[PDB]
Design a binder for this molecule. Structure first.
Ligand SMILES: Cn1c(=O)n(-c2ccc(Cl)cc2)c(=O)c2cc([N+](=O)[O-])c(C(=O)C3=C(O)CCCC3=O)cc21
Ligand SMILES: Cn1c(=O)n(-c2ccc(Cl)cc2)c(=O)c2cc([N+](=O)[O-])c(C(=O)C3=C(O)CCCC3=O)cc21
Ligand SMILES: [Co+2]
Ligand SMILES: [Co+2]
Lengths: 377, 377
């Protein structure tokens, strides 16, 4: 069922913004590890005395990395005269965010028809406002409301290239890395209580509903903006990792970003080649039992060679009633066991491919729990 | 002249510690960009609930990267019961350092005969104490005094492997990168006033003295611990970059680290291959005039091919009366135009090679100023 109740016209995931202490180092690391090009910058060299922001790009995927300069550089400025290209930025909020959370996502940004309207309707409908609609160079409108913890849902809309005040990067420094990642599939929040988070967020967007945890997935009208939310289940055999997140994150925040690849096998080869030379590490590979059992559930979907490749790469495969999902999880992206990344590719549900095709891996909890057990053997 | 007045027995540069907001991302970036192995860690996986610290290594060069976890993780601890492997660490000092300076060096560490003695004698001789001598597992003694700004000079001594509480890293994650860098040659501070900084530091160590700026170089008995210090010259034609450092750094701090390579040509090839894929950028290359003029000053030292290689790589060459110096400078290592790195190799002064052989590049100010001018042509 899909009531299509979006209170305003939502288009797609536009970009994800990380709040860092040093944007250069994180961005350069992410670029290498994930195969993302350097596309745009806003910093001293572009006249921004407030924050340093570097945009990484792979297909439609836009990762933004932002860190504050010294407040001294812009002490003579006020908001009317600001040189920051993202007017919602605030030294104190940024430093406080990073001190409280470490490296993490500050904004999940979606493109909408009209960001001023989407903010008004949102706030009229329960959203806690975070930064009011501001119009940049009469060309783009940006607005922010609280999503969960210190993560904001950021609305962006264009009259008619990322943002005003950004510049396209020197082609010399923009080496065309690409490991196959194409767009953001979903962005997942961890909260201490699912119900109120859902009710709050579903309340002001109109989005509809699509082991260690309980979770639920909110989705826009065409189900291409997918916002799962997790909560822990306490008392369990092995401690809830949603709880471990909340402890080390100092509260709710973004847990993981799921990035769609147009060739999950090439992506995972390319990322794993780089795991130990600056890139990202992947979760431990499941035992061969998980892959012996793969034939009986997806043998009609992937060849034995395609299945053998999965085993080389530690890829996970799950299937619902509409499609098949290939997925894998990185280890945490930073010092803390908090945010991580998921690499995704979906097969099926073509009419284009509809969102969520294959689910989010629900069946892999049972398949792993079992295959762990039948591997002791 | 070398009076050899060290007030205590200094051995060599032991390690450099960066204070970061996220140690993983900086370290992984530095590893790739500079060809440094992952050698040791102290973090949650080793039971450290206080800070995350990762050691990178290339030859004798030891870069340490440290970031704080949430103070909540260790709220029940006191200094006697601490789980931090570096007992001088302090969340508040670290967060304050990084908020004030961004990514930068917190400690310049030298190995000494006896760190307890070196601290006492230092403090008896004017040093502002920063962390008193602490003995770790009855095996290593560490102590800290203020060097300049918020940079500490850290004494380390061993009775008899980096530090207690660190673990050697999984050989799977320890890929043996190596671009030829072998040790730290000198670590340079920028201060607003040279005289008092010199007098202070020479005062408590016994170290002796070895455009935009004035500078002077302090050195231990065998001149293998070299600590230049810069100050600006105001009013000049083009603004002092020592001043630009002080403005963007919020005061004095470490300006650059000069790393010795056993093959500056292979290092610079390897680092430049990686400049645009996660590594480090290098300063703009000098005009061909600088290389046409190279033959007449170092043509007795490097072949025409060796000189041609220099031109490919942007290498700078200078010469004093004892030896020849090959050097190049990176662009800043982080968001701010503050700390950068210098790649060095020295030819001459063999008896072993004596420290400082070839100087620090003094002659290259004139040679560049000129070659810029004779290139307009
Ligand atoms: C597939 N999968 C998985 O297999 N394991 C796993 C690993 C090892 C062992 Cl032994 C057993 C199970 C996970 O732990 C796991 C955790 C998460 N998560 O925390 O969100 C997700 C996930 O992506 C997700 C949700 O579950 C519901 C909300 C939508 C959503 O996106 C998927 C997971
Ligand atoms: C060699 N050299 C250089 O050529 N230029 C340069 C670049 C481009 C143009 Cl056009 C003209 C000149 C520098 O700016 C420069 C700056 C520094 N520094 O700031 O310390 C150093 C340096 O390493 C150093 C000192 O100078 C004295 C204390 C010991 C020490 O280590 C060397 C430099
Ligand atoms: Co997921
Ligand atoms: Co130097």
């Amino acid at each position: 069922k899909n009531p299509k109740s979006d209170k305003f016209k939502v288009k797609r995931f536009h970009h994800i913004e990380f709040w860092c202490g040093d944007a250069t180092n994180v961005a350069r690391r992410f670029s290498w590890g994930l195969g993302m090009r350097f596309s745009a910058k806003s910093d001293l060299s572009t006249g921004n005395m407030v924050h340093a922001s570097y945009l990484l790009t792979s297909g439609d995927l836009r990762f933004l990395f932002t860190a504050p300069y010294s407040p001294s550089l812009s002490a003579g400025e006020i908001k009317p005269t600001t040189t920051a290209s993202i007017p919602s930025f605030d030294h104190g909020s940024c430093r406080s965010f990073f001190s409280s959370h470490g490296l993490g996502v500050r904004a999940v940004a979606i493109e909408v028809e009209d960001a001023e309207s989407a903010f008004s309707i949102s706030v009229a409908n329960g959203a806690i406002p975070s930064s009011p609609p501001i119009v940049l160079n009469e060309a783009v409108t940006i607005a922010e409301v609280k999503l969960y913890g210190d993560v904001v849902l950021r609305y962006v809309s264009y009259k008619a290239e990322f943002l005003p005040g950004f510049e396209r990067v020197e082609d010399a420094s923009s080496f065309p890395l690409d490991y196959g990642i194409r767009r953001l599939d979903h962005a997942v929040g961890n909260v201490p209580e699912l119900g109120p988070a859902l009710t709050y967020v579903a309340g002001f967007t109109g989005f509809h509903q699509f082991s260690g945890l309980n979770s639920a997935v909110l989705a826009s009208n065409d189900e291409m903006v997918l916002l799962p939310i997790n909560e822990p289940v306490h008392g369990t055999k092995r401690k809830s990792q949603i709880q471990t997140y909340l402890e080390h994150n100092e509260g709710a925040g973004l847990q993981h970003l799921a990035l769609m690849s147009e060739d999950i096998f090439r992506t995972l080869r390319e990322m794993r080649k780089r795991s130990s030379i600056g890139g990202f590490d992947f979760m431990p590979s499941p035992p061969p039992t998980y892959y012996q059992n793969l034939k009986k559930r997806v043998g009609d979907v992937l060849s034995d060679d395609q299945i053998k490749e999965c085993e080389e790469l530690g890829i996970l495969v799950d299937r619902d009633d509409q499609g098949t999902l290939l997925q894998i999880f990185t280890k945490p992206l930073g010092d803390r066991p908090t945010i991580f990344i998921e690499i995704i590719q979906r097969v099926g549900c073509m009419m284009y491919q509809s969102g969520g095709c294959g689910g989010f891996g629900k069946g892999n909890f049972s398949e792993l729990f079992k295959s762990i057990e039948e591997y002791e053997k």
